[PDB]
Amino acid sequence: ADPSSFASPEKFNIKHMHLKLHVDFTSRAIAASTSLTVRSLQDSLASLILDTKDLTIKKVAVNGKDATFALGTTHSFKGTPLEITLPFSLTRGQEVIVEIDSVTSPKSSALQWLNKEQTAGKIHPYLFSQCQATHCRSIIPCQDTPSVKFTYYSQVSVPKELMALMSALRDGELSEQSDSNRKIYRFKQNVPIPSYLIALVVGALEGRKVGPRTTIWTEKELLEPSVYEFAETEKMLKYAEDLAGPYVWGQYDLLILPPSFPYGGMENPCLTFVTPTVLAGDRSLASVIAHEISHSWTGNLVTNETWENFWLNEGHTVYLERRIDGRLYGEEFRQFKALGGWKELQNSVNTFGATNPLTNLVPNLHEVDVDAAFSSVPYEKGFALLFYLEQLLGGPEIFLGFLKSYIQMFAFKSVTTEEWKKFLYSYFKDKVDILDKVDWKGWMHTPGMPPVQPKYDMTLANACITLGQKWVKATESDLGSFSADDVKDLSSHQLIEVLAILLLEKPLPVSHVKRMQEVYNLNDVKNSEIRFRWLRLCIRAGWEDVIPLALAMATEQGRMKFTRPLYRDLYNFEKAREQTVNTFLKNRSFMHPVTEMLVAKDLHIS
Amino acid sequence: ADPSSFASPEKFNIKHMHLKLHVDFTSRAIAASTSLTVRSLQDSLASLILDTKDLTIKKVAVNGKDATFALGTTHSFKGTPLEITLPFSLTRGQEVIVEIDSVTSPKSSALQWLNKEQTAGKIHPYLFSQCQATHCRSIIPCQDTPSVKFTYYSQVSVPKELMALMSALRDGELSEQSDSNRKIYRFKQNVPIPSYLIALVVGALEGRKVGPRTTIWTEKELLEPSVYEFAETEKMLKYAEDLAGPYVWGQYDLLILPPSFPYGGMENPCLTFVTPTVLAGDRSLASVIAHEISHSWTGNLVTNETWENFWLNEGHTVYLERRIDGRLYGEEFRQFKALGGWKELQNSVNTFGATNPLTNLVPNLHEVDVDAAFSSVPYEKGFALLFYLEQLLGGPEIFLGFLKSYIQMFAFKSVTTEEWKKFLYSYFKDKVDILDKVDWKGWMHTPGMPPVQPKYDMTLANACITLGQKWVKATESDLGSFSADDVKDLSSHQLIEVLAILLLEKPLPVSHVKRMQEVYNLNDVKNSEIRFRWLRLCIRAGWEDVIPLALAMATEQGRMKFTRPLYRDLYNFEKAREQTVNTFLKNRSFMHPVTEMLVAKDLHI
Numbered sequence A: 001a002d003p004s005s006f007a008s009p010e011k012f013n014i015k016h017m018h019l020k021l022h023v024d025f026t027s028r029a030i031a032a033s034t035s036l037t038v039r040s041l042q043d044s045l046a047s048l049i050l051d052t053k054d055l056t057i058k059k060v061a062v063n064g065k066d067a068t069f070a071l072g073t074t075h076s077f078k079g080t081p082l083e084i085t086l087p088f089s090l091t092r093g094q095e096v097i098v099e100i101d102s103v104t105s106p107k108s109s110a111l112q113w114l115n116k117e118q119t120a121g122k123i124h125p126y127l128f129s130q131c132q133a134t135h136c137r138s139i140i141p142c143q144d145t146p147s148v149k150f151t152y153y154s155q156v157s158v159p160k161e162l163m164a165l166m167s168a169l170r171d172g173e174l175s176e177q178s179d180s181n182r183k184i185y186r187f188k189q190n191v192p193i194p195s196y197l198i199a200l201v202v203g204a205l206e207g208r209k210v211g212p213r214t215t216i217w218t219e220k221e222l223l224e225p226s227v228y229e230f231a232e233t234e235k236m237l238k239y240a241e242d243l244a245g246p247y248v249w250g251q252y253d254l255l256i257l258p259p260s261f262p263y264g265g266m267e268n269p270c271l272t273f274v275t276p277t278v279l280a281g282d283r284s285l286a287s288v289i290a291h292e293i294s295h296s297w298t299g300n301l302v303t304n305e306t307w308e309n310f311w312l313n314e315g316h317t318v319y320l321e322r323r324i325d326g327r328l329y330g331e332e333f334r335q336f337k338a339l340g341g342w343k344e345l346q347n348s349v350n351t352f353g354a355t356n357p358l359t360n361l362v363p364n365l366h367e368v369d370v371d372a373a374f375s376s377v378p379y380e381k382g383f384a385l386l387f388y389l390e391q392l393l394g395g396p397e398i399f400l401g402f403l404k405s406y407i408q409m410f411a412f413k414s415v416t417t418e419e420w421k422k423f424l425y426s427y428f429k430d431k432v433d434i435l436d437k438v439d440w441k442g443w444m445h446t447p448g449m450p451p452v453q454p455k456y457d458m459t460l461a462n463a464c465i466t467l468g469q470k471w472v473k474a475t476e477s478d479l480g481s482f483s484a485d486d487v488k489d490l491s492s493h494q495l496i497e498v499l500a501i502l503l504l505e506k507p508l509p510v511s512h513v514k515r516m517q518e519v520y521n522l523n524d525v526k527n528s529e530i531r532f533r534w535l536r537l538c539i540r541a542g543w544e545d546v547i548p549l550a551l552a553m554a555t556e557q558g559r560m561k562f563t564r565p566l567y568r569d570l571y572n573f574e575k576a577r578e579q580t581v582n583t584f585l586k587n588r589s590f591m592h593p594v595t596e597m598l599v600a601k602d603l604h605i606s
Numbered sequence B: 001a002d003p004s005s006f007a008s009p010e011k012f013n014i015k016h017m018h019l020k021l022h023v024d025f026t027s028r029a030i031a032a033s034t035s036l037t038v039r040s041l042q043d044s045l046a047s048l049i050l051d052t053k054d055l056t057i058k059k060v061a062v063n064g065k066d067a068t069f070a071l072g073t074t075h076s077f078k079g080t081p082l083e084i085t086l087p088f089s090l091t092r093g094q095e096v097i098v099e100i101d102s103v104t105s106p107k108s109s110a111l112q113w114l115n116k117e118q119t120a121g122k123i124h125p126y127l128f129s130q131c132q133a134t135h136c137r138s139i140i141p142c143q144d145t146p147s148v149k150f151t152y153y154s155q156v157s158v159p160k161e162l163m164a165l166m167s168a169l170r171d172g173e174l175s176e177q178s179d180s181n182r183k184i185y186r187f188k189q190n191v192p193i194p195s196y197l198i199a200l201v202v203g204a205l206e207g208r209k210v211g212p213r214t215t216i217w218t219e220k221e222l223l224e225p226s227v228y229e230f231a232e233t234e235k236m237l238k239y240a241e242d243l244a245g246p247y248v249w250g251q252y253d254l255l256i257l258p259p260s261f262p263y264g265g266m267e268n269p270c271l272t273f274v275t276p277t278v279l280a281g282d283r284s285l286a287s288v289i290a291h292e293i294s295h296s297w298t299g300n301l302v303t304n305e306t307w308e309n310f311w312l313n314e315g316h317t318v319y320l321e322r323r324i325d326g327r328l329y330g331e332e333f334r335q336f337k338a339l340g341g342w343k344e345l346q347n348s349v350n351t352f353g354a355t356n357p358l359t360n361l362v363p364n365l366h367e368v369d370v371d372a373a374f375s376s377v378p379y380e381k382g383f384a385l386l387f388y389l390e391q392l393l394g395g396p397e398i399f400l401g402f403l404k405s406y407i408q409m410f411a412f413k414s415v416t417t418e419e420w421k422k423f424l425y426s427y428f429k430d431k432v433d434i435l436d437k438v439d440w441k442g443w444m445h446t447p448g449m450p451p452v453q454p455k456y457d458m459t460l461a462n463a464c465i466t467l468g469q470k471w472v473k474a475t476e477s478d479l480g481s482f483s484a485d486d487v488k489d490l491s492s493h494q495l496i497e498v499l500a501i502l503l504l505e506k507p508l509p510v511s512h513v514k515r516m517q518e519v520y521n522l523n524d525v526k527n528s529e530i531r532f533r534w535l536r537l538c539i540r541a542g543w544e545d546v547i548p549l550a551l552a553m554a555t556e557q558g559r560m561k562f563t564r565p566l567y568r569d570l571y572n573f574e575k576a577r578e579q580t581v582n583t584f585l586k587n588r589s590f591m592h593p594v595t596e597m598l599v600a601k602d603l604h605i
Ligand SMILES: CC(C)C[C@H](NC(=O)[C@@H](O)[C@H](N)Cc1ccccc1)C(=O)O
Pocket: A132, A133, A263, A264, A265, A266, A267, A287, A288, A291, A292, A295, A314, A374, A561
C-alpha cells in the first residue's frame, strides 16, 4: 500500500483505460469519460477506492446501471478518496468495466492553461500536463500509485486548428460529428504504464523528423534552435539500447514546452517533455535527453513500487545516463559527473538536514507531500550505491550484466528495494561474500551522507576544489590575485562544480562577489545551470545589485530547480523581501500550479 | 491470420480469462464459466467469433445481458464457430467482459479420462489435458490461435484426495457451497500465455522438492524413481538462464503422467508434463527436461504467430537444448546430437515424401489438420538452419548473442519468420554480405532435405556408421563375425544412431535381425528410444517373433512417437495385420482421443 495514494493495490488493479477527453479552453476544463478495467485481487470485494484531487465526479456506471459513489474527507495534499459500491461482490481475480464521467477544476495541479498572450505564437492558447508524482488524480479518477501499471487508449476532442499529443503512439484523427469547430486525435499505449506517465499537450505545434523514430515538436519560433540542440537524439537512443537492451516503446519524440514547465525533462513514454532552459546553443545541458532516454528502461519499463522506492527509478537512470556519457566524452568525464553527484548529494543533505529522515535512500513518506519532498538524494545517493557496488563487484562491464538481467527480470512490472536486493544477491551468487560487506542499513535507512565514498578520478575536479578554496579563504588584499585565467581553462561543468562548492560553504563577502563579476563576467553567461548558481551566491552574499537579475530569472522561467530556490533566497534577503513578494503576486496567476503552491508556502503567503 | 483458427486477431483481442472449472469424473466433463476480457481492435465491432470443438454453450452474457449467439457451418477438424452478436457497437481500444457458460463433451480431444483400473494399482481416477496445438477449443470457447496471448486466473472444483494442478502458480486451497463432492484449488498466471499453454491435471498426486523452484509431482509408486531421474532440474534451469537470460515464470515444476500421455514432454508454464517412458534409470533420456526448460523462452515467452511458423518455437528450443547438453556432456556430444538430428529429419522426409509441401520449413496449413501434419521437420530443418547460420556467422558465442537479443526483442509477443529474418539482418548488419549468400528459398519453402548440410564432428558417430554399414552389407557367412564387442562400449545415444541408420537402409533379412538378438540381446533393453527402433527394424525385416513384443510396447505406452509408427508398421505386416486391428479394438476405449483418432487414417477403417 502506497502512503501517497488512497487506493489499495493489494485489493484491486486497473489493467486498462479507455479515455474520452473533452478539452475546453474557454472553460479551462478536461471532461473525461474514463472506462476502467478493474481486476479484483481480494475475494468478495464490495467497494472500489480511487484517487481524486479537485475533481468533480458526475456519474459512475458498472456494467450499465449506475453505481453508488461517495467522496471522503479531503486530505491536505493526497486529495479526496472516491468510493464506488459495486452491484456484485465479484470472484477474484475477476475483471469488470467501471465507466466514470468526471470534469477537472481550472486550478488542476496537473495542468497549466496559457492564453495566446502568454505563448510564443501569440495567436493560439496552449495546454500541457505534468502528472509526476501524484497529479494524475487531478485529471482522471485512478489508482494514482506507480504500483498499478495499465495499458490505455484515448480519444481527445480539441479545437480543430490545434494539435494534440499524448504519451502514446498516434492512432489517427477523427471528425467530431457534434462540433464542426472540433477535431478528435486518437492515441494507443499498448505497453502497461503507471498513472504518473500519462501526459497531454494541446497547442499550435509543429514537428519535423530528426531520426527514424524521432520527431521534434514545439512552436515554430523554438523549432529551429531545438533541432540543433537535440540533433544527436538517435545516437543517444542507440547508445542506450547497446547498454540496456531493445527499445519497446516504438517511438521516441521530443516536445519543448513554454518556460513555465516545472522540470528540465519528463520521460513521458513516446514523448519526452523538455524545458527551453537547456537551449544553451552548445548542447552542454543536452545530457537531459540521455537521462530521459534511459528512463525508457529504468522507470518506464521497470517502475518503482511507491515513491519511497523512487531511487530505483532515478538512481539506475542516473547510472545509465553516466554510462552513455562514458562511451561519449570518455571515462574521465564519467568519473567527474560521479564526483559532482556526491557534491550535489552533499548540497541536498545540507538543504534538508543531515538528520532529516527525508534524506534516507528509502524514506518514510507517511503524511508527506511528495512535491515538497523532492531532492537529489534518490538521484545521487542511489547512483553512489550502484557506483560503489560496481567497484566492489569487478568493474562496469560486470555490473552492466547485472543491470541488463535486472531490466529483463522485472520488465513491465513494479519493484521494491527488497526485490532489487534479492535479485542483486541472486545474480551475484558467487560474489555474495562481497555483497555481505556493504553496510545496507547505513545505505538504505540512515539520513545524511552515505557510509562509504566510492573511489573517483580527480583529474577534472582538482582545478574546481582549488579555485573554490582560494575564494573562501581570500581576504580583501588577495582579491587582486584573481584574474580571467582562473575560469578560462575550465569547461561549463567545471564552472558549475566550483560554484556548487562555493554555495556549500559559508556566505561570501559583498566585495568577493563584486570581484567575481569584475574578472569572470558571470552576469552575461546564458548557461542556466551556471547563472542560477551565480545569482544564488550573490543573494546570500547580500549584494543589492543582483536583486533585479534574480527576480528576472525567477519570473522569465518556471523550472522549480531554479525558480523555487531563487524566490526562497530572495525572501530571506531583508532588502529584497518586499519587492519579491509583490513580484510573485503579480505573476501568481501566470505560473504552473505546483511551482505556485510551493513558492507561496516558502514566502509564508499560501 | 492462423488458417487453423476461425477467430480474427485483427478484430479483437482476449486480454484476460477468469476460469471457474467444475470437474466431474462420473460424467467425464468440465463445465466452465469463462469470463473473457475482450479488447476491440476495430472502430465498430458488432460480432465476436471464437473457436469451439465438441463444446456445448449454455449461455453468453456481455456485462450482464442475455446475449444472442449462433453457430455457422461446421468444419471437419477446426470445429463449429461461435458468433456473439453484441448489443452495442464497441469502439477501437475499448475493453468489455464476456461471460460464457459451457460444458465439454466426454470425447473432448484435449482431455483423457482414465479409470481407477487404468491408474497405478486401484486407488483413484485420473484426468490430464493436452491443448497444443488446437485442442484448447475442446475445453473452453477462445481465440485458439498462438497469435493471441492472455493472462489468467482459475478456480477448479476437485475431490479431496484428487489434487488439482494448472499451468500457473498455486494461489491456495479453499472450500465449496452446494454439490459438496469437490474442493477448490486456485491458480494465478500473470504472464500472458497463448491458449495452447493452458493445462490441467486432477488425480491422486504427491510431490517432492528437488530445488528452490522445482517440485516433482507424480503418484507415490512413480515418485521415488522420478526424483532420481530428474534430480539435476535446477542445474539445467540455471544452465538455461546463463544462455537465455532470466526465468520470468517464478517456478518450474514437473509432472509425470500415466503412460497414455501422447508426447514425451509438454512445456506448460510453471508445470512441465513428462512421459514415464523417459524413466530409464540412468538419465540418458533426461535431455527432455533441458528442452521444455528452453521453451520457457522460445515458445512461451516468444510465441509462434501461427502453426505455419512452428519452427521458430521448436527449432530454437532444439538449438537451446543442445547448447545445454553441450555444457553438461561436452562440445563432442553437442555435435553428435546435431548429426543425429539430421538423421531424424531424413526419417520424417522419408515418411511424408521428399516432395510433400508439408516438409517445407514454413508450410501452408490451409485446410490441414495440424495433429496429422506433425513431423521432425520444424524441429530438425529448423535446428539445422540455426546450426548452419552459427558456423557461417562466427561460432556459438557470436550466435548466442543474437538469440539473447531475439528473446529480449520479442518477449511476451508472437513472431512470424519475416520478423525473425528482419531481426537476424538487423543484428548481423556487419555480415549482410554472408547473409545474402544463404539459399533462403531452399531453406524456407522447398520440400525435402535442406539445401546445405552443416559441418559436424564425427568422433562419436564414426563407430555408428561403420557398424550399420557392416550389417547392411553382411551375408549369411559374415553373421559369425559380429559379437557383443560391436555395441557393449557404445553409449545409449550411439546405439540409437546405429538403429536409426539401419531403419533408413533397405529391409534387413530375418537371419540378420535374429543374429542381432543373439549377439546384442536388444530384446531386454528397457531404454524406450532403443526398444522402439529395435522393434520397428524387426517388423521391417518380417520377423514373426517380434509381433507380441511390438503389440506390447504399442499398448503399454501411448506416446505417439512410439505407438503410431509401431501400429502402422504392424498393419503393413501381412502376418500381424489381423491381430493388430483386433488389439486396437480391445484398447480403443482406454486410449487418448488424439492417439485413438489417428488409427482411422493409419489402420484404414
Ligand atoms: C537529470 C536531469 C537532467 C533531469 C531532471 N529530470 C528528471 O529527473 C525527470 O526525469 C523526473 N521525471 C523529474 C520529476 C521527478 C519527480 C516528480 C516530477 C518530475 C530535471 O532536472 O528535470
